[model samples]
Structures are given as structure tokens and as C-alpha cells.
Target: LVHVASVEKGRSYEDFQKVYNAIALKLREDDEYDNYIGYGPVLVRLAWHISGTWDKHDNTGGSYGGTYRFKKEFNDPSNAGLQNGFKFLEPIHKEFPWISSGDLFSLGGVTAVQEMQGPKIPWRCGRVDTPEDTTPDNGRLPDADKDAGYVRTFFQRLNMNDREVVALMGAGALGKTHLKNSGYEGPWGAANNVFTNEFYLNLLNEDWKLEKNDANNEQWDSKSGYMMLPTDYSLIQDPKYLSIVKEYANDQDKFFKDFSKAFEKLLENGITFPKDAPSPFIFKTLEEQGL
Candidate 1:
């Protein structure tokens, strides 16, 4: 028989808010990374990848355990270039030693998205740090080189449906692919940092040519010097996905509403919160805080 441990005590809303302030200050200070792209997008992606590993059925993997701090998880080849995000958080972690690794990592994602003008992702606390041996195996993250079918099939394991998949991918438009990281390159939109529906807009408006990137991988490119991964372009190739794409592109409020829900789900995948657990916390942005 297996024994289930009780959820660990975590920082309260006010304390976690302090941690958020610390992370926000650091993000503003370190404005130079990946050719001055800042640490915002990759940090959001890091939190996504970490939480995205949850299987939903057994709950073996997810953000519940802050395993990404371990070598096995961090050194995973799929996590290349994320070292920058990890390193970026080191000082903040040092400053706020009381917060658990799990809470810190998830909070970083929330801060990144909100600070970058994305939707407000509600966050809860409960994740606890586990041993290095608990690190999940690699190959769980989505492959950038695959097609629409693969993308859809892969996300199903995480219990995401078509609508959820579209919202999640829309978040991808916030950052560019690094050749050194994913063997692909190019920004998905003009405002790579700020969260907007520009990704869906570009997909609908741009005249994309099926072309190979410098890495010899095929992606859609426009004459205006923008690019989209084949999997990204796949949004329009499939009718169902195209509809959601059009909806988000046409209405920012709807996109924000859906993206907020989906993003919170993505970040909170495996953990089971108690019924009476506190509601998700929304941290103030740097501008809102007047920092």
C-alpha cells in the first residue's frame, strides 16, 4: 500500500505577495537576456513546462514538487536555455528563503505573465519540494518539431481539449524560439514581451510561405520577417483550431478570459487543493504597485 502525505504548509497570501514583489523587482532589473528579450517569456515557459508534465490520472508529475531545481530535471536536454530563467531566479530565491521551491517557481510564472501585460493568472499554494529521485523522466514535454496531430495527442495526456490547446498555444506567441534551445528561431509577433493576441492576428493576416528556417526545420514565414512554427501554423490548417484562433484574434476580452483560466490550469495541473483552500491570489503588477 502507498501512503499519501498531507499537503505541506505554504506561505500565506501576504507573504507570497512579498515574494512576488521581489521577483517583479528582479525581472525589471535584469532586462537583458536572449538578445535583450528579458526574462519574462522564458520564465513563463519554464513554469509551463514544469507544470505541463502532469499525467492527471496518477498525478505522478507536476508543479506540486519543485523538482526543476534538481540536476536531472534542469539538465534535461528539452530544458536547454531555461538555465537563464533559473539563474535569474536564484537571487530572489536567496532573498526569500521561506517560500518553498514549488511556490516560488509557480509564482514566477504568474509574475512573468502579469508583468508582461498578459491575463491575471490566479495562483494557489500547496506544492512541496521532493527528493531528486522524484524527478520525472524526460520526453514528457511537447516536441517543437511535430505537427498538429502530435500536438493535440500530446496535450490530451494532460487532459487538455481542443479549446484549451488553442489558448495554451496562444501563450507561445509571447516568446521567440531560440535556435540553441529548440533548434528553431524567430519571434511569433512584434511585441514578444507584452501579452497580446498579436500571435493570432499575425497568423490570420500574414501571407505565410512554407519555408525552412536556418535550422533546416519547416515553419511559416511572412514577407514582413515574422515566422511561425509548423505546429503554430497548424492552428489555421485545422478547422476547429482555426475557429478558436479567429475568436481570440477578433476579441481581446474573450482571449484574456480564456487565457487566464487555461493558464491557471496549466500551472496548477497535478496538485490537489483542499476544498477550503484559499482562492487564487492575483499579485499587483510593477506599474500597479508603483515600484
Candidate 2:
């Protein structure tokens, strides 16, 4: 059954904009994290991991429940390093005590994207907290060691097709993989702190070799000082995914627009906004506000 969670009462665009500002301010202040890559990537990642648990067939898990705060989901192997993101949001959640867990987690992603110069992801707020029983068990998230078909098949559980899958994977450009966390190591591109299509560019243009890392895991290593998961390199190797990868590589504007749409769709997964719900809000970036 499709779940249409209602927006919090008396909330308006300005209210959400305030939450966005608080996140943005903290993002600027929290420069010591991950060697100053800061909170942007993990915030976006936190949003993804929360939303990724959705199984489209049953509308189970997903961001609507905001279940990541629950111990089981928090300790899931796939969520190893996400504790930092949760820690970061805890204070903000305290300040904005009324915002639902699912809403705050998802909005952190939207704020991180725009502040990192990505794109305007139209967002809506309506996720209400659910009980711990609704939390999907661990192992629902995708494994990073798989091939193109595995990558394709996994995202289908989240109801994303090739285009959406490819676009979202482009987000891989923003964060570095930590061996201590996920047993994966290396960044996807030079500008690991910036949101860009460098993931696709590196996949298509880099001189990558199949190599095992310090973690003893096979990853595509490039002389350009970038690395990709087997699933990431799989995009270029597969004909269907390769097409979309090439399209994004050739056009940054198109990537941003597609990514915005795909990202909004991702955060909204399993959520049904009513017909009279306010239009999705595109909050101003920190730079736009002269902060």
C-alpha cells in the first residue's frame, strides 16, 4: 500500500528554510570531520542509506519511518561510518525538536547538495516517526562488491530504473570511501568535496586497473589517484548503464538536472504527498543568502 504521510501542521516554507540554514551553518562550522571533507557527503549519504531501505513492492522501511536512529539500523554493517552524520544531526534535531526524524535526515541531503554547488533538489516534508518494529532488518542495503547487473537489480528494489540509478551513482563523486568503515578505500575523483559528474568522467576517461586494495578487496584503481567500486566501474562496462554515464559525462548541466530529479524522487520514495500539499520547496543556498 502507498503511504501518504501528512506534512507537519502549521509548517510552511520559511520553517523548512530555517532548518536548512541550521544545517548549512553547521556544515560550515564542522570542518574537522573526515580530514575536512566535513559533513556534506555523509549527510547526503545518511539521506541515501535512510531512503535506500525502501522496498517498493511493499512500501517497507524507507525514510518515512526514520528508523536509522534505531539501534539495529544504526549498527547495520552497511551503515558503519554513518554514525558521524547522525551525531552531526543530533544537535540540529534538538534545536528543531519538532522536525520528524525522517524529514531531518532527508533534508540534510538536500541542504548538503545545494551548499556543495550541486543543484536545487525540490523537497517536501511529511515523514512521521514510526515504531521500531517497522524498521527493516539489516542486509537490505546494497553490497559494493557486485557487478553491473547486481547494481541494476539492487536499485530496482528501491523502484529506480537505469537513468535514476545512474544519476544517483553520480553522487559517488562527492565522498571518499573509508577502509575503516566499509572496508573500501579511495575517492572517486579529485574534487571529493564537490558534487560533480567526475565519477562518470573518471569511469570513462581514467586509466584504471583491476587491483586489490589494502582491505584486500578488488577495486578499479586509476593512475589519476581515483578509485571506484566494482559496481561503479560496472556502469561503463554495461551497455545500458554506459549510455547514461556517457550522457552525464558529456553534459554537466544535464547531470545536475537529472540528478536533482532523481534525488528528489529518491528522498520522496515511499512518500505520498496529498493533492493540496504545498509545492516542493527549493530553498536558497548559503551563498545565495550571503552567509
Candidate 3:
């Protein structure tokens, strides 16, 4: 299946910038959601979950389809808490109905990351929405309880390597895992809403005690009121992954650069862009525009 990039008719960078502003502005105004963490984290998760469904072998499920709008994808158990993000985007979608579901969804994450003092993810616009039947089934997402080997193997289907896996998982720093949604709970670090290398730092520096939550899921908990899913903890347990973790923890700029590239690649997977397509846009955050 070859999903070609088709820019929305007559739309340009400025048009998408408006959409970006809307999302960023709402992210600032809707400040009380999730105890003031706002919708940033969930937006990032939504974007990742939507794109993470891709299988490199067959290329059936990916951001290309924009099928998450369908019930099957939206109601996915792996996507339990993401309805909040979908709802938050409802108004934005209504306002700019021209943007494809995949474009809007992926752009939301880019906006959230930049608005929250994170890296600037260069984004391409043009993922047309596929039919309902194109929506991939559930269970394509990874399991939180797994270890390093599992994390490594699971990401292979997505064509991500060790560095890419570590960079992408840095998003774990953004939000707390709600027990209701994933049988796990707790923020990965003090800066829950801000994107940083803190997840790697916490994994390496904290005195994590392996404990069971009320859900009976064993997670690595810290005395500092943070926690790590076994899969997150695995980053430091594996020798190679541990080195990348330490490198990212020690260098914020490097992490930001690597994350920007990896994240854009993740969202662009399974889609082919012709040489004539518009260059990927690097949007300016609201702060940069002084809006």
C-alpha cells in the first residue's frame, strides 16, 4: 500500500500555522485538565498511539490512514484515556475542517511539544483519511509491563532502532499513568508537563523500589513520588540502552535534536512524500510570535 502525500488543496504553511496556534492557545487556556497538566501530554500520547500502530512488514496500520477517528481505533483498550485528547481537539477540528485526521492528530503533538518548551518537530501535512475498514485492530501497541528485550523487539516491527526507541520513550516524562487507563499510576518526574531528558535522569538517579500498585501491577516507584513502567525502567537495565539514557540525561540539547528527528520520523512512517511536496514546516510557538 503506497500512501502518497497530498497537500490539502490550496493550503500552505500559514494555514497550518493557524491550526497550530489554535491548539497551542487552547492548551494554554484549558489549564485545569488532568490537574493543570493540561492536554499537552495526552496530545503527545494520542499522536504517538495513532502512529505507533504501523507495521513495517505489511504497512497496514500507520499514521497514513488517519483511521483513529473510527470507533475501532478510538475505542481501542490501549487508547483508553486518549478520548480526552480527542475531545480537546474537537473544536480545533471543527474550525479547520480541511486538515486530514492524521495531519491534525500528528500536528497536535508537535504543537504540544513546542508549546511546552520542547523541541521543534518539523511536520509535513497531507495524510488523507482512509476508510473505516482500514483501521488497524487493537493490541498493536506495546505492553507497559514488559522488559528491555520486549521493548527492543516490539519496536522492530515499527523499524525503530535502539537510539530511536530511547528517544521516543523520552515522552514518558510528559504525563502520569492513570491506574484506570493502564493499570499503572504516577508521574515519571517532577516536570510532568514539560518535555525534557528528566525521564532518563529519574530512571538513573532515583532510588526506585519495585512495588505493586493498587491494580496489582508491579512498577518501579521512587521515594520522590515518581514511577517508571517496567518498559521505561528497561531503558537503563539494558547495557546499550543505558548508555543512551545516560547520554540523553547529561545533554539536553542532544536529546532535543535526536527526539525531534525521531518523532517526525515516527509520525511520517509508511507514507511516501514526492520530491515536489512542500518542505516540512517548523512552526513557531505562540511565544515566538508573542501571541
Candidate 4:
């Protein structure tokens, strides 16, 4: 049950950076996706869904395996809208076939985040692909219709603490939920493409009304046309989660830093890195590289 890091043959940081540049360039060019939200949000969600299957006690499922390419994981009900992300990466994968599926899937998230102006997430290049049988069963992912206690307990299996949970959920600010996919709709903030602490700010500042959507699911809606999944609103409902939510809402830099750490940890879960494994690479955004 051990997965070691293995760099692709004759590949180094520069090669991976080239792959990153390709993804970033496409992200910029594909401006019409999701109503101009681009591929950033769905790419982030795809990475999270792929990695979120990890179970700490057994380590059977995680980003280390790259099993999401298989039928079961790919068609996972929890992964409904993520097909867009997979199709988006098809060209990148075809161009650089040496990168393992896990590596490409996880790297898409890192590139998307940094390009979207989020914090720098130092990424490692490894994660060999596991067989189709290795894919975790569906429903390992969390449900959005839950409360504070449910959120806490569900994240416990993933080994995320309160701070980690709040930090990771901050990504909710990036995209809107589609009713056809997750049975929910609407963006969490004004800027759906840019990364920000607006999720926390909106949760605290908005006068949220609990209403049933067309999907007959309950979500907190605001007059400004933003919505919060039950699990997201739970952050402010629970006293302990409320404190961390408040902290992230007030300090943007701190949220970014903590989120970078927590997100990297989440993506790296269930994999054992050797002492000789190269250090994580901090990639430059296209803007930073003057592309």
C-alpha cells in the first residue's frame, strides 16, 4: 500500500513548466467556457474530486493513483460536471503523454489556481497511474446538502482540521454551481473567476435566506444573487467553524497562505515521498513570466 514518487524519464522542472504554460495559455484562450468563467474553476474541482477520495485509515484512494481515468471514478455521481475538466485536459495530455494521469490531473489544479491569481502551490511531479480496479467506489466524496456536524465528520476521514477545512473551502469563491450537475446554482461572489476571500466575506456579510432551489435542495441565497451550499453555510453556523471563518474573512493573505498549505497537503495525501524526491516546484504564472 505504498506509492513512491517517480519523476518522468528525462523530465524536470522546465518540462513541467512548459506543460503548465500550455494549460495557462489554453485557460486564457478558452474564454467562453462556463459563461466566461473559463476552465479554472472546474479544473480546481476536478483536482479536488480526484484527490478527495483518499481514506486515511487504508490509503486505498487518492491523487497518488490517478484512477479517475477509469469508468467508475470518471462517471461518479459526485463528479457530474467534471467531464468538462477532463475534456479540457485532453489536448494537454496528448501533447505531453509522458506525464502520468495523476500528475496531469493534479497539476491542472495548481496551474489553474496560480493563473487565476490564487496563492502559489508548490507541486511535485510523480503520481503514477493505478489500474482500473484501483479506483475507489463512488460516494467517497462529500455531499453538499449537509450541516456543520456533517461537514466536520466528513472532513475528518480526509484528516482535515477546522482551519484546513475553512482554508480549503475558500475555493468556493471561484465558481458557480450548475443546477444540471450538482442540483445547485449561482456563484458565491461577484468575481467567479478570480480567487478571493469573498466566500467568507459573503457568508458573513450577506443576509442569507434558506430556500429550496429547482432541484428541491435547500441552499442559502442572498439578494445579490449569490448562493451557499449547506455545508458552506455551516462554517458560519457552528461556533468553532465560525471563528476560523471570521479569521479568514478578515485577513486575505493569511487565507491564501493557509489555503496553499492545506491544498498541497490534500493533493499529496496517501502518497509517501522518498527523501531523495525533488523539492516541490513553485511555478510562475503566465503573467509573472510575461507571457
TM-scores, each model vs. reference: 0.94, 0.98, 0.99, 0.99
* Model 3: per-residue Cα lDDT over 1-291, one tens digit each: 889999999999999999999999999999999988999999999999999999998888989888999999999999999999999998999999999999999999999999989999999998999999999999999998889999999999999999999999999889899999999998999988888889988898999999999999999999999999989888888999999999999998999999999999999999999999999999999999999
**Which tens-of-lDDT digit does each residue in 1-291 have in candidate 2?**
567877888899999999999999999998788887888999999999999998988889888989998999999999999998999999999898989999999999999999998989999888999989888999999998999999889988888999999999999888899999988888999887788888888899989999998989999888877899988888988999999999999999999999999999889888888889888898998889898
What is the overall TM-score of model 4 with all chains considered together? 0.99
Candidate 1 stretches greater than 4 Å from native: 1-10
In terms of lDDT, the poorest run of 10 residues in model 3 is 57-66
Among all windows of 10 consecutive residues in model 4, the one with the lowest summed lDDT is 1-10
Cα lDDT tens digits for candidate 4, 165-184: 99999998898999999899
Cα displacement (angstroms), candidate 2, residue 76, comes to: 0.5
Tens-digit per-residue lDDT, 99-132, candidate 1: 7787788888899989988888888776777788
Off by over 4 Å in 4: none
Please give the clash total of every predicted structure, in order.
0, 0, 0, 0
lDDT of each: 0.82, 0.91, 0.93, 0.93
Candidate 1, poorest ten consecutive residues by summed lDDT: 1-10
- The stretch of ten residues in a row with the least summed lDDT in candidate 2 is 1-10
